Amino acid sequence: GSQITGTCPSGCSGDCYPECPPGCCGQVNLN
């Protein structure tokens, strides 16, 4: 890990629940 996640946990990266702030989920992928 280098950039890691601030407020939004892994769950937000994967499961984008409503309380996840905009662009928090699926925002770290060089794809």
The whole-angstrom separation of Cα 16 and Cα 23 is 10
Residue 30, domain member (yes or no): no
Range of the domain at 18: 1-25
Contact status, residue 29 vs residue 13, Cβ threshold 8 Å = no
Contact status, residue 28 vs residue 14, Cβ threshold 8 Å = no
Token pair for residue 3?
Answer: 């950039």
Residue 17, domain member (yes or no): yes
Give the count of domains, the chain.
1
The whole-angstrom separation of Cα 17 and Cα 2 is 24
Residue 31, domain member (yes or no): no
Q: What is the DSSP string of 1-31?
A: --S--SSS-HHHHHS--TTS-TT-SS-----
